[PDB]
């Protein structure tokens, strides 16, 4: 097997000895923490015969020092990988409450502290040994790319290189300043996903708000509707035969589902921090579902900058959605407030281990405070829970309460099969909401076109793809990377591909004169703004 790269970077052994030794030096000054590591583990003095069955590749400061002093490391990544193996042997063998498990953890604290800057000034990205979180002995490792002009291996996630965007391979930042070239634009941005009237409304609401209270670190927000499609919820068999042969209510119930996502710019790159999936039941839907919206589910990653404003803008998103559907025809929404189960993630693949998922009362009062802001906001004219809304809007049978896809009531009515029910309504009353947009006739019209995009049809597609491809949202850097790859997924697996149209003639034109500041204004030659060809 024969390989090449004609002007690689190799480090003279005294070079990387001089660069790396201060970091080992640090590890060594940690007394006593470093003491069980200055020499190899001797199971004869410790009385642990099983050790070399558990730890197959021992490593210790003295071995790394000997390797360093005799130039056995040709690239700093081998140095780094050796000391991480030492730490990983420490963590693997000893219980997480061990004394030397703790020692190990502190040594790792300070080796992280020291290795990032030196590795950086040796051209590389960090000095970390990274691994993806497990699924279902093995772990999958983080990916690397090798710079094309210098050969310095770097964490793909760290430097955010994706071949599909820059198909000529990867070249580092320094190898570019060395050639005076600037970086090539990521066209596959959140901003440049298809913009749409709904998403524009939400993003305008929160952008004005975060200007209103402006922390200097907050960045631009982009809301975007990434899929939209006409589905119908089929009525479950028992529940169906007691009311459809009757003819009281319909076989199916037609709605439009929309998946919509929010991105913030953080360190100059989009970081997708919020997602939502709604079912909207139009004016032509047979009752009970007529003119109702329902948020099928919500999800969030807490890396919004600044975490102070986090919740305020989650709320401004939700209430902007209520405002928008209000304005064009719907009259009641519905927020079943159910906490994320198990280790089940709603919309985003792998959540940050330090992001606490609420218990239902936290959840219920969060929804309640968002709703209160909406009431005060002139926007929603009232709201109350499902029980006090089912007996105030007096109701005697089951085909009278909305019947949504994947909702709880459909399934519990279904299993009330062997017949009580009217009373379970207010056991779970504070988790199910009812939301009145109007106080109080012309039909709904959705300006926004359909967006066929299977990855965002429902929620299983995107989670599955992300679990495969390891797009986790567990780190700000992993989130950055997963946002990147998800955006080029949305951009290049456009199940819609466009039949452009000009705007003064409503024609269908191959060559057109786009406008720069209009959101989509083209003109077939055959006007105010600066048009470009
Ligand atoms: C059968 C089946 O599967 N069926 C289902 C059917 C679908 C159900 C449909 N229903 C829904 O869609 C219901 S709404 C969506 C529920 N899902 C989630 O919420 C996902 C995870 N959570 C979040 O994204 C967020 O919490 C969010 C609610 C979006 C906003 O959070 P936040 O940032 O505004 O504040 P915080 O998180 O409440 O907490 C804010 C403070 O609370 C703290 N905190 C939170 N939780 C806890 C806790 N448990 N213990 C202690 N402290 C705790 C936290 O430290 C923090 O502190 P600080 O502000 O000082 O830093 C299926 N289809 O899978
Ligand atoms: Zn790195
Ligand atoms: Zn380079
Ligand atoms: Zn024309
Ligand atoms: Zn224009």
What is the CATH classification number for the domain harbouring 50? 1.20.920.10
Q: What angle do CA 427, 430, 434 make, to 5 degrees?
A: 115
192 phi and psi angles, rounded to 5 deg: -90, 5
Q: Where are the beta strands (DSSP E) in 63-211?
A: 144-146, 153-155
For residues 273 and 366, what is the distance between their CA atoms, to the nearest angstrom?
A: 18
Q: Resolution limit in angstroms?
A: 2.5
Closest of 405, 386, 400 to residue 457, by C-alpha = 405
* Token pair listed for 148: 């094309």
Cα 125 to middle of ligand 3, angstroms: 11
Q: Among the atoms of ligand 1, which is closest to the Cα of residue 297?
A: 12
- Calpha distance 30→427 (Å, rounded): 57
Among protein residues, the one whose CA lies closest to atom 49 of ligand 1: 358
**Residue in this structure with the two tokens 């028992």, named with its chain if needed:** 238
Q: What is the CA radius of gyration of the chain?
A: 29
CA of 224 to the centre of ligand 5 (A): 22
Q: Is 451 helix (H, G, I), strand (E, B) or coil?
A: strand
Instruction: Give the residue whose CA is nearest to atom 64 of ligand 1.
Output: 346
Residue 99 CA to its chain's centroid (Å): 37
Burial of 303 (0-12, 13-18, 19+ CB in 10 A): buried
| Structural domain includes residue 478 | no
CA–CA distance, 336 with 258 (Å, rounded to integer): 17
Alpha carbon of 262 to ligand 5 centroid (Å): 26
DSSP state of 344: -
Q: How far apart are CA 482 and CA 474, in angstroms?
A: 10
Atom 36, ligand 1: which residue's CA is nearest? 358
- Helix (H) or strand (E) segment spanning residue 514: strand 514-515
Question: Going along 301-454, which residue ranges are E strands?
Answer: 332-333, 382-385, 433-436
For the chain, give the longest Cα–Cα distance.
91
Contact 381, 437 (CB under 8 A): yes
Residues 25 and 109 in one domain: yes
User: Strands 221-234 and 153-155: what pairing?
Assistant: unpaired
Gaps in the chain following residue numbers (C to N > 2.5 A): 136, 419, 440, 526
Phi, then psi, of 498 in degrees rounded to 5? -85, 145
Quote the tokens at residue 271. Answer: 């970081």
Together in a domain, 111 and 30: yes
Length, in residues, of the chain: 533
Residue closest by Cα to atom 3 of ligand 1: 341
CA of 178 to the centre of ligand 3 (A): 9
Work out the burial of residue 39: count CB atoms within 10 Å of its CB; fewer than 13 is exposed, 13-18 middle, 19 or more buried: exposed
CB 16 within 8 A of CB 76: yes
Whole-number Å distance between alpha carbons of 216 and 331: 38
Do strands 433-436 and 382-385 pair parallel, antiparallel, or not at all (unpaired)? antiparallel
How many of the other CB atoms lie within 10 Å of CB of 40? 11
Q: Could you tell me the two tokens for 224?
A: 């975007």
Specify if 419 maps to a domain.
yes
Ligand located closest to 334 CA: 1
Please answer whether residues 292 and 336 qualify as being in contact, where contact means their C-beta atoms are separated by less than 8 angstroms: no
Question: Which residue has a Cα nearest atom 24 of ligand 1?
Answer: 300
Task: Report helix angle 310-328 to 360-376, nearest 10.
Answer: 60
DSSP 3-state assignment of 382?
strand
Cis preceding-peptide flag for 288 (omega within 30 of 0) = yes
**CA-closest candidate to residue 84, choices 162, 139, 157, 12:** 139
Task: Check which CATH number belongs to the domain holding 506 and give it.
Answer: 3.30.60.90
Q: What is the 3-state secondary structure (H, E, C) of 301-337?
A: CCCCCCCCCHHHHHHHHHHHHHHHHHHHCCCEECCEC
Q: Tell me: do 416 and 517 sit in the same domain.
A: no
Q: Is residue 218 part of a domain?
A: no
Q: Which of 87, 101, 32 is nearest to 58 (CA)?
A: 87
Task: State the closest ligand 1 atom to the C-alpha of 298, by its place in the atom list counted from 1.
Answer: 15
DSSP label at residue 65: H
Structure tokens at 529: 């703004």
Q: How far apart are CA 194 and CA 47, in angstroms?
A: 65
User: In terms of domains, do 444 and 532 share one?
Assistant: no
Distances (CA, A) of 122 to 65, 169, 248: 19, 21, 74
CB 230 within 8 A of CB 256: yes
Dist CA 5 CA 318 (whole Å): 53
Give the separation between CA 409 and CA 434, rounded to whole angstroms. Answer: 14
Distance CA 531, CA 528 (A): 9
How many angstroms separate the Cα of 40 from the Cα of each of 58, 134, 456?
7, 30, 53
3-state class of 273 per DSSP? strand
Cβ burial 109-145 (10 Å sphere, 16+ → b, else e): ebbeebbeebbeebbbbbbbbbebeeeeeeeeebeeb
Q: Which domain holds residue 242?
A: 232-255+278-452
Rounded distance from Cα 270 to ligand 3 centre (Å): 24
Task: Note whether 391 and 291 are same-domain residues.
Answer: yes
Tell me, in angstroms, the distance from the centre of ligand 1 to residue 366's CA.
Answer: 9
Are 198 and 226 spatial neighbours (Cβ–Cβ below 8 Å)?
no
- Look at residues 333, 343, 300, 288 and name the one whose alpha carbon lies nearest to residue 134: 343
Enumerate residues lining ligand 1, CB below 6 A. Answer: 297-300, 302, 310-311, 314, 336-341, 344, 346, 356-359, 362, 366, 406
The protein residue with its alpha carbon nearest to ligand 1, atom 56, reads 356
Omega within 30 of 0 (cis) for the link into 32: yes
Q: How many CB atoms lie within 10 A of CB 512?
A: 18
Distance 234 CA to ligand 3 centre (A): 57
Strands 221-234 and 252-266: antiparallel
Query: Across 153-236, where does the E strand assignment appear?
Result: 153-155, 221-234
Of 391, 417, 452, the domain-final residue: 452
Establish if 146 belongs to a structural domain: no
Per-residue CA distances from 81 to 57, 73, 77, 127, 146 (Å):
12, 10, 6, 9, 17
Q: What does the alpha-carbon distance between residue 256 and residue 294 come to, in Å, rounded to a whole number?
A: 11
Ligand 3 center to residue 15 CA distance, Å?
Answer: 18
- Same structural domain, 422 and 521: no
3-state secondary structure of 195: coil
DSSP state of 517: S
Are 116 and 158 in contact, with CB atoms under 8 Å apart?
no
d(CA 488, CA 440): 45
List Cα–Cα distances, 421 to 387, 402, 432, 473, 506, in angstroms: 12, 15, 15, 40, 55
Question: Which among 421, 452, 483 is the end of a domain?
Answer: 452
Which residues contact residue 404 at a Cβ distance below 8 angstroms, ignoring those fewer than 6 apart? 233, 279, 289, 294, 296, 334, 410
Q: Do 509 and 402 belong to one domain?
A: no
Pick from 335, 358, 474 the residue to mutate for probing ligand 1's pocket: most ligand atoms within 8 Å of its CB. Answer: 358
Nearest to 474 by CA among 343, 378, 311: 343
Co-location of 409 and 310 in the same domain: yes
Quote the number of domains for the chain: 3
- In whole angstroms, give the CA distance from residue 173 to residue 24: 28
Q: Point out the ligand 1 atom lying closest to the alpha carbon of residue 307.
A: 61
What is the distance between the alpha carbons of residues 138 and 271, in angstroms, rounded to a whole number?
A: 29
The label of the residue with tokens 């967006």 reads 451
Q: Give yes or no for a contact between 273 and 301, defined as CB atoms under 8 angstroms apart.
A: yes
| 309 Cα: distance to centroid of ligand 5 (angstroms) | 34
* Within-domain flag for 303: yes
Please report, for residues 38, 58, 91, the alpha-carbon distance to residue 86 in angstroms, rounded to integers and kept in the order given: 11, 7, 9
d(CA 87, CA 92): 9
User: Is residue 139 included in any domain, yes or no?
Assistant: no
For residue 459, the ligand closest to its alpha carbon is 1
**Which ligand 1 atom lies nearest to the CA of residue 302?**
33
Ligand 2 mean position, distance from CA 85 (Å): 17
* Burial call 457-483: b when 16+ CB within 10 Å, e when fewer: bbbeebbebbeeebbbbbbbbbbbbbb
Tell me whether strands 269-281 and 252-266 are parallel, antiparallel or unpaired: antiparallel
Pick the residue whose CA is nearest to atom 22 on ligand 1. Answer: 357
CA–CA gap between residue 254 and residue 413 (Å, rounded)? 20
Tell me if 528 is assigned to some domain.
Answer: yes
Q: Does a structural domain hold residue 349?
A: yes
- What the block records as the tokens of 365 is 């009062």
Method: X-ray
- Is the separation of the CB atoms in 123 and 10 below 8 Å? no
Which mutation among 276, 346, 365 tests ligand 1's pocket best, with the greatest number of atoms within 8 A of CB? 346
Token duo for residue 505:
């003639």
Residue 181: other Cβ atoms inside 10 A: 10
Q: What residues flank ion ligand 4 with Cβ within 5 A?
A: 502, 504-505, 524, 526
Buried b / exposed e across 206-221, counting CB within 10 Å, b at 16+? bbebbeeeeeeebbeb
Domain boundary among 121, 141, 168: 121
Co-location of 105 and 34 in the same domain:
yes
Residue nearest atom 57 in ligand 1 by C-alpha distance: 356
Cα distance between residue 101 and residue 96, in whole Å: 6
């Amino acid at each position: 097997m024969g390989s090449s790269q004609p002007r690689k970077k190799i480090f003279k052994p005294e070079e990387l000895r001089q660069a790396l030794m201060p970091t080992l030096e640090a590890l060594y000054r940690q007394d006593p923490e470093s003491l069980p590591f200055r020499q190899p583990v001797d199971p004869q003095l410790l009385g642990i015969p099983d050790y070399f069955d558990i730890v197959k590749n021992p490593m210790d400061l003295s071995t790394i020092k000997r390797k360093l002093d005799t130039g056995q490391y040709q690239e700093p990544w081998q140095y780094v990988d050796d000391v991480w193996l030492m730490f990983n042997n420490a963590w693997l063998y000893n219980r997480k409450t061990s004394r030397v498990y703790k020692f190990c953890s502190k040594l790792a604290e300070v080796f992280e502290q020291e290795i990032d800057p030196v590795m950086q000034s040796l051209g590389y990205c960090c000095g970390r040994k990274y691994e993806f979180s497990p699924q279902t002995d093995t772990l999958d490792p983080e990916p690397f790319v090798d710079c094309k002009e210098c050969g310095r291996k770097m964490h793909q996630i760290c430097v955010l290189h994706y071949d599909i965007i820059w198909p000529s391979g990867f070249v580092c930042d320094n190898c570019l300043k060395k050639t005076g070239r600037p970086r090539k634009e990521n066209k596959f941005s959140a901003k440049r996903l298809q913009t749409t009237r709904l998403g524009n409304h939400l993003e305008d609401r929160v952008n004005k708000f975060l200007r209103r209270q402006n922390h200097p670190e907050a960045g631009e927000v982009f809301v975007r509707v990434v899929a939209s499609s006409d589905k119908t919820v089929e009525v479950k068999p028992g529940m169906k035969s007691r009311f459809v042969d009757s003819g009281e209510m319909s076989e199916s119930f037609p709605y439009r589902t929309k998946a919509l996502f929010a991105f913030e710019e953080i360190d100059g790159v989009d970081v997708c921090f919020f997602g939502m999936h709604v079912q909207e039941y139009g004016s032509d839907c047979p009752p009970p579902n007529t003119r109702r919206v329902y948020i099928s589910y919500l999800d969030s990653i807490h890396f919004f900058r600044p975490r102070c404003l986090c919740t305020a803008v989650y709320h401004e998103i939700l209430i902007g959605y209520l405002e928008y559907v209000k304005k064009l025809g719907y009259v009641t929404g519905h927020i079943w407030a159910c906490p994320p189960s198990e280790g089940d993630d709603y919309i985003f693949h792998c959540h940050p281990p330090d992001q606490k998922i609420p218990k239902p009362k936290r959840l219920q009062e969060w929804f309640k405070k968002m709703l209160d802001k909406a009431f005060a906001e002139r926007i929603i004219n009232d709201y109350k829970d499902i029980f006090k809304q089912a007996n105030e809007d007096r109701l005697t049978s089951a085909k009278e309460l909305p019947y949504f896809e994947g909702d709880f009531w459909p399934n519990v009515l279904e299993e009330s099969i062997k017949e009580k029910l009217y009373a379970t309504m207010e056991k779970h009353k504070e988790v199910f909401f009812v939301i009145h947009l109007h106080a109080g006739q012309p039909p709904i019209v959705d300006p926004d076109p359909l967006l066929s995009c299977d990855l965002m049809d429902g929620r299983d597609a995107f989670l599955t793809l992300a679990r495969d491809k390891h797009w986790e949202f567990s780190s700000l850097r992993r989130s950055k990377w997963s946002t990147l790859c998800m955006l080029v997924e949305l951009h290049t697996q456009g199940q819609d591909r466009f039949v452009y149209t000009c705007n003064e003639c409503k024609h269908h034109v191959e060559t057109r004169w786009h406008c720069t500041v209009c959101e989509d204004y083209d003109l077939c030659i055959n006007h105010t703004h600066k048009m470009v060809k």
